[PDB]
Ligand binder design. Structure first.
Ligand SMILES: [K+]
Length: 250
């Protein structure tokens, strides 16, 4: 009954990103000069889209990116930025602020692979995914409550959106449109949840290696959700991937 677009953007570069140090929930660094530039370029790229809703993590690097994107936007000045701590980066505990290479050493020393390993004080992959699941539940409820004017009884075929390599791909006739600004590990985990764990459609020519790749700073992804209410429970009946980790603006 409600169809809405979700655009997902990773925050712009920090000095930690540049120096390849792990950045989680505890070190609240700002954008570097490079990050400010990347955020402005993403803001210019998305400037002609109306974001009816905006959600950002509580972390400064993400808040700044969201602020720059909205400042550059030509349609969304009345949209409030909602801070949601559920969008924070995966926690890395004692590994945070150490070279990403140190995490690999810790994994090795502990006998597990980089994928199985969670450092002390850190979050496991399932814990991060649970946060995204909670975010989705909150997102659906908020979109549904606010966009009664957009609700429709008309069902469609799971055919492909128009993807022309432009900023509005897949959203040309989708007026309800949320922006989500978050973090690389969180987004990667979230994308895999959407694609693998849920019923999901992916367009012609999109390689799975791309779908599951790490997101660059200000890399942009897009999904279209169709949600239904049954027994007062909201559920996604269709999730359509449009593009993943796009960085044409860079
Ligand atoms: K699936």
């Amino acid at each position: 009954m409600l169809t809405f677009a979700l655009t997902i953007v990773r925050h712009g570069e920090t000095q930690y990103n540049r120096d390849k140090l792990l950045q989680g929930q505890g070190i609240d660094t700002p954008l570097s000069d490079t990050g400010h530039q990347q955020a402005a370029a993403a803001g210019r790229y998305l400037k002609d889209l109306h974001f009816t809703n905006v959600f950002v993590s509580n972390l400064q690097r993400a808040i700044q990116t969201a602020e720059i994107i909205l400042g550059n936007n030509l349609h969304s000045s009345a949209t409030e930025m909602i801070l949601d701590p559920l969008l924070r980066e995966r926690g890395f505990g004692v590994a945070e602020g150490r070279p990403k290479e140190h995490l690999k050493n810790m994994a090795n020393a502990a006998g597990q692979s980089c994928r199985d390993y969670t450092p002390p004080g850190g979050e496991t992959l399932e814990q991060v995914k649970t946060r995204f699941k909670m975010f989705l539940k909150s997102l659906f409820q908020r979109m549904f409550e606010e966009h009664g004017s957009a609700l429709s009884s008309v069902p469609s075929e799971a055919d492909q959106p128009v993807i022309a390599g432009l900023a509005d791909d897949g959203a040309q006739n989708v007026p309800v449109h949320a922006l989500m600004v978050s973090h690389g590990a969180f987004i990667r985990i979230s994308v895999r949840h959407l694609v693998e764990d849920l019923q999901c459609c992916l367009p012609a020519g999109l390689k799975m290696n791309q779908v599951f790749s790490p997101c660059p700073n200000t890399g942009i992804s897009r999904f279209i959700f169709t949600i239904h209410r049954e027994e007062s429970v909201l559920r996604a009946t269709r999730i359509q991937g449009v593009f993943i980790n796009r960085k044409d603006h860079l």
